[PDB]
Each structure stands twice: as C-alpha cells, then as structure tokens.
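Newbie here. five chains, one complex. Structure please?
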Amino acid sequence: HMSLENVAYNVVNKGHFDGHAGEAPVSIINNAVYTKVDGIDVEIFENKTTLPVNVAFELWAKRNIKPVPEIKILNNLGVDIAANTVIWDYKREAPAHVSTIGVCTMTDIAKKPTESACSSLTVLFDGRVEGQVDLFRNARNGVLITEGSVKGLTPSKGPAQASVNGVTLIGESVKTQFNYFKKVDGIIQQLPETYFTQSRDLEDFKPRSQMETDFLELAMDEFIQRYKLEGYAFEAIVYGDFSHGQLGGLHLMIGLAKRSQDSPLKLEDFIPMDSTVKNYFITDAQTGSSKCVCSVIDLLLDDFVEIIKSQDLSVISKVVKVTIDYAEISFMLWCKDGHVETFYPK
Amino acid sequence: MSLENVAYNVVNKGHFDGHAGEAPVSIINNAVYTKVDGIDVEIFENKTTLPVNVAFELWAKRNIKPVPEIKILNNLGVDIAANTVIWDYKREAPAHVSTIGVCTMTDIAKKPTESACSSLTVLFDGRVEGQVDLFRNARNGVLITEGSVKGLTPSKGPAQASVNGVTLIGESVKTQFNYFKKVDGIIQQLPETYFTQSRDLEDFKPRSQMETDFLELAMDEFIQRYKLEGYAFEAIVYGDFSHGQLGGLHLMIGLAKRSQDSPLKLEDFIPMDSTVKNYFITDAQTGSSKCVCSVIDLLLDDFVEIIKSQDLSVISKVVKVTIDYAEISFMLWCKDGHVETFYPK
Amino acid sequence: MSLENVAYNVVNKGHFDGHAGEAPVSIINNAVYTKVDGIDVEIFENKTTLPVNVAFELWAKRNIKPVPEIKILNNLGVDIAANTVIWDYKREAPAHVSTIGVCTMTDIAKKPTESACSSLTVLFDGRVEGQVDLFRNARNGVLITEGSVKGLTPSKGPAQASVNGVTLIGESVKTQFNYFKKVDGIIQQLPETYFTQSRDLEDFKPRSQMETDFLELAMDEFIQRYKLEGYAFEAIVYGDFSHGQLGGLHLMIGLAKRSQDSPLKLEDFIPMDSTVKNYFITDAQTGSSKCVCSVIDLLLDDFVEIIKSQDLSVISKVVKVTIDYAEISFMLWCKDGHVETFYPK
Amino acid sequence: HMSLENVAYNVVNKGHFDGHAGEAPVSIINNAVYTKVDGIDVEIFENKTTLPVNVAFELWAKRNIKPVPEIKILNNLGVDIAANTVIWDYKREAPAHVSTIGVCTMTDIAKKPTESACSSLTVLFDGRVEGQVDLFRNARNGVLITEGSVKGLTPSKGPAQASVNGVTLIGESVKTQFNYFKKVDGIIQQLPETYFTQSRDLEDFKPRSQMETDFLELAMDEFIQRYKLEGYAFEAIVYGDFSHGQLGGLHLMIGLAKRSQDSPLKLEDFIPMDSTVKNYFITDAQTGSSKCVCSVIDLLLDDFVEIIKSQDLSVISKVVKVTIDYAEISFMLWCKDGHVETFYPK
Amino acid sequence: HMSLENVAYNVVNKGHFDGHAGEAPVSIINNAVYTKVDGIDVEIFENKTTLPVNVAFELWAKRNIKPVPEIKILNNLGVDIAANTVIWDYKREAPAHVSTIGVCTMTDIAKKPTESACSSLTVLFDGRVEGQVDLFRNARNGVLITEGSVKGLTPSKGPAQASVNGVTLIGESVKTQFNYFKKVDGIIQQLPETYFTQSRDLEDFKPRSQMETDFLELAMDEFIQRYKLEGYAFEAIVYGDFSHGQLGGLHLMIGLAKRSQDSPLKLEDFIPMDSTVKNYFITDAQTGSSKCVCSVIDLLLDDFVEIIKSQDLSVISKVVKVTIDYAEISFMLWCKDGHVETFYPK
C-alpha cells in the first residue's frame, strides 16, 4: 500500500498524493527527491524541514489542497495537530504541526483523532470531511472548522481569507470563510470577539476600503483632516518617521505600502514564521533610516481607526487589549490631555 | 584535464576555454569555491545527482553556441551528444547521462565512431569540422546544420534555439537549424510539424494579429471575429474559473490572458522541459484550481488550424498532431457537429 | 558565549545586541533552527565555508551602521576589522577571514593593538569610543570617520555606503566617510579618485543631465550634442549587437540603454563585488554574446572627463586611472588622432 | 510492487530481500537507512557507495547470498554485469557492477539478459538458476558458471574458494568450485590454464600444504635447505628484508604471515579493492623499515616454487607472463650468473 | 602543474604524493574521494578534518612518510608549522598544524620559510633535507631535528621512539632518535633536561626494565620492599585502588597494564589527541569502579622512582615541576609526617 515510490508516483502523474496505485523510481540525495524520466533525473522535492527527507516528502505530497485556515489563526487558537490531513506551511516549506494523525506511519501519534494520545492535544477537525463534526463533539480538546451551521453550537465567523495551495485569497468559486468552534478540557468554549488581520504582502498590496484608497492617494494632513483624526497621532503611529537615523511610526502594514510608492523598503524577516504581529528589521532605501524589531500588523485602516477612536484619552498610560486573529494583543497607550501621544505593542 | 584547471578557465574566461592554468579550489556543501583576495567566493552550486566536481566540469564545458531546446532533442530520441555538453538550464544539469570525449568521468567513448556509441542516437553539429561526415558514417544520429547538406533532404526546425540558457530567435547569429535523423543506418524522413513557441507566462507576448486580438478582446468578440463558434474555445482555450475545479487553459496564451488581470500559481510538479507541460494551477482571484493542467504553447493560429481541420461527425476520436517533432495524441469530443472538449491523452 | 545566547538575540532583537537570554536551537543541514511553539523555524542558512555555528555567530554580529562597500575596503588592502564584522550580503559571508574581539572561534586577538594585528591593515571606525586613538597607535590600518581628525588630512570617500546590505546615499544618516590610511607606521596620502556609482542594471537611474540625455537620445544625436566624435563611444560605451561576437558595453549605463529595449543575461561567474566587474553577457534580442565583458559604473561625465584628458598621438598605451582608491590599467588605442578602443587590463 | 519500505520490511524480518510483501517504516538520513522499532530509530543500512542511499539499500538487500565467485576472478574475466542478480563487493561495501539486469528500476539497463542493451556486455550466467545455461548459449558475450558438466562444452575448473555473505571459504556443506565458460563476440572461448590466488587474510593465515606448514615453523636457511631452493632468492623475494630504510621482497602473502609471527606490520591498503595482485604501503613495526607500494600476492607456496622452478635463468632480465586468476600477470625476473636475484610483479 | 587529479594519480600509483606527472579520474562526494578503476568507484580517502575534502586530500597525500617526531614532542616544544611538509596526526586522521609552507596553495602562508609571514612562528626544520639546517640558522623561531651532529650548536638527545607512518617505534633500520635544537627570537636555547614518555598502548603493553618486569610479576608489598619503596604509598599513587565505587590511584600507564592482566579496563579518551599527560574516563570492568579525569602518564618506572625518591617530603602539600617531553609539568605532592600521602598533576 504505502511507500516512497507510491508517493512519488502520485506526485508525478497527479501533482500531489491522491491514493492511486503505482510506483515511480526515486533517487534520494542532497536532502532532495529525484525521479528518472528518459534516463535522467529531475528533482521533484527539496527538504527544507528538520524531518528526514523521505518523511517530509510524504507529508508535503499529502498537503491539504482544499481551502485551509492560515496558520496564524490555527496557532492563535492553540491547534497542536490536525485530524487526518497535513496543513502545509508554504512560507516555511514545512508542516505546520509536529506530529500527525492517520497520515504517515513515521509521524502519526494515532491512526484516529479520538485515540488516547490525542486526548491532551487541541486537534483541528474539518467539518467538510465525513463525520468530523461528531468526532469533535466528544473530543477533549480541539477546533472545528465548518462551511455551514452546526446543530446545537454557536459559531464564530472566522476570517474571509483562507489558504488555497499557499495562495491566501478570498474565495469566489470556493468557500474560504469558516465557522469556528473550540473545545477545551471537554467543555465547549466561546471564542472571543476579534478583529481579523488582512494578510497582504508589501509587493501586491491593494487597498480594501474607501478610507484605505484615501490613505494612499492623499497627503498626510489632508487625510488626517478628512476622517477627523487629529489628536490620534497617525504621524507617530501609522505613517512612519524617516527623518531620523532610527526609524519611527510605521506600525501598520498599510503605512508601509505608502512609502513603498516613493521608496523601496528592506524587511528582514528575522523570525520567518507567520504570525498576527510580525516583527521586521526594516531599512529605508531613501533615507538610511533603520529599525531592528519594528512590529507591523495588517489591519484594515477602518478597523484601526475604530480601535483608536474607541479609546479613553483621559489618563497618562493604559494597557489596552485588542483581540485580533483570535489572539489577545497588548498595547501601551499614552495620552496627554485629549491628544494621543503614542500607541504600540508590548 | 583537472579541477584546478577547469576552475582557472571558469574564473578567467567565464567557462572552459581549453586554456592552461590553475586556481586554488575549495570543495564544500556540494559547491565549488575559489580564493580571491584571501576569501572564498562560490563559483558553482551543484544541483545535479553527479558528484560535485564532475558536475562542475560538465557545466563549464557547456556548449555556448545556439543549441536546440532540450525538448526537441528528447522528442527526437537524442540519447547523447558528440564532443560537447548540452546543458539543461531549467534543471541546472546535463541533458544527457554520458558524454563523448568531454570528461573522463562520464565519457563512454572518446569519438562517436567507437562501438559503445553504435546503438545510441548521437547529436551531430554540422557547425564543426567533419561532424557532418561522421553523421553519414554513424548508424544512429541527429544532425543539425545551418545550410544545405548535399544529397540529403532537410527538415526545417524551429526558429528558436538556446544561447546560454536564453531561448531566442537569432538575429545576429543563426538559431534555425536543419534536421536529419538516422535509424539503424537508414536515413529516416522527419514529419511535418508544428513548433511550440516556448514562451514564459511572466513575459508572454503575442506573435500574430490573432494572438494580439485574443489578449485584448472580450471572449465573444474574439470568437465571433474569427468565426469560431462551435469549436468550444470557451471550454478549451479560455479557462473557466466559475467552479471549484478549473476548466480550459489548455494553451499557454489562455493562461497569459488571465495573468494580465490577476495571477495564477503554477506548480511545476515535474520540472523538466517538454512539448506538453502539466501544471498544478491555482487561480488567485477566484480559488478555482486543478491538479494536472496540460498546457502546450501553440501559436493560436496553429491551434485554430488544428481544430478547424477536424471532422466533428464522430462523438469522439483520437487525433494525432505532430508537435515539436513528437507525435501527440488528443481526444476530440463532439455533439451535433460541434466540438465539446479537446485535450491531450 | 552561547549558540543559544546568539540565537536569543537574533529572534528577540533582530541580531546580536548583548542582551542576556537563551533560545533553544537545532543544528541541521548547515542551518540554524529555533523552536517556536514546538515547531522548527529556520533563522540562519549557512552559505559560507565556515562551520554553521561559527558563521551564525558572525552573521548575528553584523555591523548594522552604515559601512563602506567592500570593494572600497578591498581596494584599500583592508585585511580585518576592529571589534565588528563587515557582512558581505552579495556572498552572504564575512568580508574578512578573521576577527578581533568579536567571536572566540575566529578571534586572532581581543584588541586591534596586540601582536597578531601589527602586520594587518585593520579597519577602524571613528564613530566608536576612542577607535580613532587605536588607529594612531597602529602600524597598518584604515580609518573612517564622519568629521575632522586632529592632525590628519582627510580623504573624501564615496557618497554611498552600505546599510544592512542596501547601498545608499544617506539622508537621515551619514554615508560619506573620511578616509585615512597607515602603512608600516607611516600615514599615507591617499590618491585622488573617481568612485564607482554602484548601480544595478534592474533599477538603473541617471544622476546627471548627461546620463539622462544618453538614455533618451539616439546614438549620434548624443555624440553630436556632446562634441564626442573621434572618441569612439560607438565602439566603447554603446554596445554593438550585430555580430555573433558582442562588442562595447564597458560602462554600466551602456547596458542600461539596451535594457530599455530588450533584456540582457548577465552571468556573474565570479560573484564578488569590485570596481571592475566581468560578466558573461547574452543579448536576448539578437543572440550576440561575449563571455568576458569588463564593465561597471562610472558617471558618464566622469568617463567623458577621463577619455578627453588623454593624449591621442601614440598608437597604443597603458593608461592608469585611480578608481575606488585603486589604480586600474587600461589599454588605449589610437589611429590618426582619433580614439579606436579603450578597455581594462 | 517494489518499494523502499518493502525492502526494509524484508531486511528487518527476513535478514535480506526475499520477495515477501509488506512495508516497514523508514527514515533516510545521513546517507543511512533507519527503521522504527519500539518508538526509537535503529540504523539498518549505511551507504558506503556512490549511488543514492535508497538505490544502494535496494541493491544491497538483493545480495546474491549463495556462494558466488570472488570479484577479482570476475574482473579478470571482464564481467561487466550480472544476469538477474546482484554481486555485492564486501571489501568496498558496494555493488560489484555499475548497472543491473532485472533487479532494480533505478539501475537496470534491461529486464532480461536477452535484450539489445546487453549484447555488447559480458554477462554472468549461473547454472544454479533455471534456464540460464540455455540463455548463455544464445547471448553473444558472457561468462557462465556451473556446478556440474555442460553437454557439448569444455569446462574450466575455477578456484576452490567462493564468497558466502562476504565470507570467502572452501565449501563443505555447499558447493563453491565452479566450472567457467566464456564467450566473446559470438564464439565460445578457450580459457587459459591458471593458478589461483588462495585469498587468505593476514591476521588468520592458515597453511594449506605441508610446504607452507614447514615455511612458517622452520628458520629461513633451514627451509631453503630442506626444500632445495638456494639460488632462487627466497631470502630477498619471499621472506622479506627489513635491514634497510626500504623494505625488500615480501612478494608472497605467507612471507608477511611469517614475519607477523614475530612482530607486526602496518598495511595501508591505499586502494581498498579486491584484486589478484594487491599493493600495500607496508611498514614494519619492529625495525622501522617501510615501503610505499609492495606488490603482495597470495599464492600457494607450492605454486610459487613451481612458477620460479620452471623459469629459465639465462638472460640478465626478462619479462615473464604468468596466468593467475585467469589474468596474465607480468613479472620482472632478474638472473645474474646462476641465481634469481629478484622476481617481482610489473 | 598541481591538481586534485594529479594528487589522486600519485595515491593510486605511488601510495602517497610523490610529484609524478599523470591524472586519475575522481569523484568527490560525502566528504570523501573516489577513483574510477574499470568502470567502478573505489574510495581512496575519507575526510576526518575540518578542511574542505579536496584540501585534506592534498595534505594527507603530502604526508611525511619518513620517521617524524611524535606530535606531543612538537606540541610541547611549541612547533606551529612545519617547513615544506605536512606532519600528519594519525590519531586524529587530521594534520598537526593549522597552516603549511610550500605544500599546498590553499593552505600555504609562504612558499619558503624565510618569508615575513613565518617569522612569528616556531617552524619545524628537518636536518635530513637539503639546506634546512642552514635555514634554521637564519630563522627567528624554529625547532631543528637532525640525525647526526650540527656545526657550532649544542644538541639535545630526543626520545628513542618516533612515528613512522603512524606506527610509533624504535628505529633499527632507520633512525628515530633525533637531536633537538630550538631558537626563540633569534637566540639559541639550551633545552631543559628531560624524561620521555614511553608512548605505549594498553592493548599491547610490554615492560622495558627489570624494575618494570618485577612490577608486573611480583605482588604489591613484595615489590615495594624489594625496591626500598616502602613509605611512598604506590597504593594511592601508582597501583590503583579498585575497592571503591570511585576509582582510586592508577596514575601511571604501567599501573594500568597490571590490572589489565586480570580484568579489562574501559578507557574513554574524551579529548582524543596525543599528549604527555592523558586524561581518561576509566571504568574497571571487574569491580565496577569508575573515575572521570584520571591523569594517565606513561613514564618508565625507573624514571618515576627517581622523580619521587629525589623529593623532600617535609611540607604537607607541595607543587613540583618535572620536565617531561621538553614540557614543564606541575605536580601536587602530599605528605603526612615524613611519608607520602598523594602525588598527582595540576
């Protein structure tokens, strides 16, 4: 049934593991996989994981190719493992999770998600596959994602985007927005009210609201004026300060895309794992201004305006907690009289 | 003649020149380094299955003249090359397992006249002394030439060739070769062929009025302008993104039309060059995707000619089109005298 | 003093900073991995020839301030840097073999004063506490500062420096440095220099009216406007793509002009940065190619000045030009009072 | 049917490849094959070859485990490829041949030794397997080994030793001495009359004739006397001279075994490959005497006597041909006025 | 001229590097060198060093095949680099020195030892090679070794043993006892008078004097009395106490050799390179006694008795400098009322 040659067969004739019978000849060398075609080798996989080459290969081939949650959502929810699939982290070119359930005999800690060894683990269940709802229903720890309503349970509307083959997108011919359900120590949990990150890169950044379009096109103070934002210090928080040797402002992703129109930015991703709050070691080409550990987060400007506009400016320093991507993010908020002085992560 | 010699040539003449000389060389991490100003600068990353030092040799001796695209040699049964290395720039490896009089570690022979060559189809380049003649004396081979060969009928090959991993139509250098094949001592007579345009999606440009009309105009305008109704272009060429699994996108230009507006991810799951390519495509705008999309880059005009010259009486048949010197099988489905679907087998 | 301490600094502060703490590490595949929520995430890929753990320490101990481009340091004969690492992002490796007070595994000393350093041209930085005084007390060394130095004549350096692998003319930060040198105890009078412009072919931009005009205007309309006939710009700068052999393109801007019409393939066969670069260039448009093209960036104005201030009576000479603090030898050919050709070495 | 996991299943259960269906879980790492046993990895193969680790594993497991000719004897007959089996070189820890016939998808040049790609190669045929003798007749280039007689064909008695699982021995419970038959370009060959290397190791050298028993026990001049050999230079050819900075003679293996009885010798086997004539960088521990490249060959002492005794002694130096292990071995024989001064391989 | 393919050619034909013209086909893979002999690859080198595989190869082949000083003697004398040769450390299968002179372009710091680069380094010179005696005279720092006597310089008789191709021995057919001369900063040095370590293995230990034979033969106090040694507690210093879980005594190699006649001793050479004083994690297989870091030093007993008997045993605990192998080794001497309590280094 299950073999390296069989996995390779699927990879070359079907583009991923499908479960078709067959064998393809394989060379393992240089932490990579090659197959013979017309007497010559053509590389079909490159191991970027800390797993043995043939194991990582089996898991990669067994990718979940349907729309799946972005790993940051899964991380923020406490997901430790997935039930009978592999959630592939495309930007680390690695599996999202340590172990496995019913996928690969080398990494499996169970063949079925409700075995004793999964008892203590928060297991991802997919409602789209037959009978995983009822598996979740009597599982100690887990997360359930569904497309439709679930009888007896209150849903938390997840984010609009999902990951489809490493492409993170809003579905149109396919459903990307899931309902989330969580279970901890045997009991149903109510997920918090959250904002959701927008999940845009700096290269392909597109605006997603009238306010965002206005943010890119208009000058600093003519924008601050239009949306009545004076006293919320967009210049020190959102915009970015490039006048000094040390870098300032530039906390939001959209504020970065603004400079990107004039000047290129280098972002060293020193810890290259996807998270709600990304820290970059940023260098500005135009000025020379640089900052290691510059925290950056992609919220809709509207969401951000709504965050900061609902804030009591009557004290020196508050600890402000905002729930984003299912995680509780801590901000320091410094206010003077009725002016916001600064706003930033901990 | 040696590692340190190959290195010297590489750093001082950009490749192997047959120059005498030697540079100190450091082998580590499946790579070649040479010392300049007392520090190591990498000059070769080995991405082959051959031992590091051997790959370096064969890479350096990579033929730097216009040579045929590797897919053409493959379709033609070319098993080996005479006294040169045809380097595969898409895999970063030699096109062939063994060599002839190139490197001791891979040579099966020193000359294509030797016995161990007799059963192999050797590529002969008429641009070098006596190789035209060697071809006449070989049992199995493919000859490429720029001009006429006396007493032999030529097959006009594709306009493109590869110069240093860049595939182009030569203006200042000749890229369109003549082709001759021999099997078991008999001159075989090569088929009438179409040639694939070998274009990338990321730099795709139209090469006729029809292709230009295809990229600019709405689906219906184009279909009507070229009276193509019933030939199922909406289901074969254009690409349907309305469902979970995506349809169409059988030609390269159909993909290029999408890319204009929104991007496609193309997983090249078996990454070697071929007439027909299969990509695991995801459509970014939509979420529609398909494992194994066969994509062939044919001039739209050539495809139009192909499909229009077909009998739509039968419910479905096998259609053989000679493309890039290979014989490709298509499945042609029909209902009531119009094309339903059309795809490689 | 721990792989884990270096690691902690990298994940938490972006690089080595001096903060106490320890992050868990896995070493595999010539790379450093760290654990975040039970899964391994790669924080370093070793592309150097040094042990993976050593290279990691040195990479983390990068100099993050604006520092000179390594070509300048090489041209100056700098063997080592005082209490810092000059990272080479082009090769992703340290610019120098060993270190001073940086890493215990490669240190040849803790301070740039002691015996081992005596015979090595040490790089000193005037921006760090009393390193100017360490320069005064050294046999061999090069000093960079921002302002004036007591009793020392400055050499005005290039406008650009490198900040975190990005070459720049700093607006919020000083990139132009003052250069001082010392050979076997004696302060040197550094020669007058042209400086190389450091532009890439991808993002090339003009920096003078003359350069703008060169990119915009037709060949002889530029030469006529700039009183340049008989200076052989047609042969030297512009680029000839009409033969199998490729001619011209001795300046970066020449390649920039062609790239406006069609792309060029550049094999950087020896991939270290330097005043004069040599590329294996293929012209996509025509098929023209040349394996060893000596090239790189001088202001077109700088080059015009150089070629014009030359006596053009002798049939051929060797000409010395001090670029990037280094004497570059050129061959200058002349027939009947007009320039024929002009090229490096 | 075939796979990496299948091969491991065979190896862990049956000790080598058997054709048993089934799969064992595997980690390829560090050019080595690991299998999971009770939670922990146990290394079951270590790639010492230039082939991909997984291809080498497959080839190894498919060892011919019955008595097979030693590799040197096969190389002297110019055997390029074995027919539907794998001869394992235990001194190299590598397959004896480059390619394969009907053994492995990665290395096969053909499936049957009856195909076109085989005509020009000398193929090892084994009478111990059905239809192979018959196959030999038709195939143009080949060497056939048998246990008994072949109707209509002249046998050639091969050496008494053969290899069983990398243990070279003379069979008592199993037959090891084969008749050899060779064939070139269509025509059935006539094999030269041969001596055979006795192929004994240094640490456990055992005498195989009364002459050898006496050689070891009796002193130098006592042996030469008892066996009538004065003027055949046994003192400077066989026994070995350790009086000079450079070691002399020791042409015969038993010569080293003799000197070993007293004090030890370091042997840098600088080319670790089986062959009729072995070359060593010997260093004598007792004296300091040493020599780069000493041609050391293990002949039955009786055989060497016969070789030198049938030798003419007229000229001052002749080049002599001696057929050992089916290979014509050249020797330089120096005669002076009546005595062999020295006699060594070219 | 010089190349990898040339070095290879030398190894497969001359046993080491000789300077012969020719080339051999080579494969570099898995930190090893292979050569093609009749269609197949035979490994001829395996890299155990921290240098690029090809570089370690250039150096290993250019081994000193002559009798050479043992590494400890050089390490104790401060030799940093040999002139125009590699001193191979066979224990580490690595070279003994960081750099090289006129040996290999990739590791040379000078083509001749007279260059500026060499002047701050103690350069090993061999009196057996043309003019290196003269080069020593004009050198700032260095160590000379000669067979015979040198004009106008006071010699120092070295150890009777030297290393011949890794094999440490007393030369009988070739000289291993060297004369030692040393310069520091232009000035000649009169070297300290010294005992030499006997450099013997436990695996094949032999006695070297009547006193040592009596040690290995006679029981404890019978021997102690016989040599008027009573009052020094060899019980705690030499013989080794095994009655405790923590291993007692056993500070001499011959002492180790005694216990080795009755029961095996496991030795972990956890810092495996050769030196005058060697530390081991020792485990006695009979009792179960164990001790990490027991300084084992192989002095001849006649030497050790001389060291201890020429000692004033008044002060309770003392520091003693003994010169062994041209190095000054510090010792701690303990004494209770005129008799010896304990004696070890540090």
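Moderator note: Chain A touches chain D at residues 1-6, 23, 25-29, 34, 36, 52-55, 105-106 (CB under 8 Å). Chain A has three domains: 1-65, 66-191, 192-346. Thread marked as resolved.
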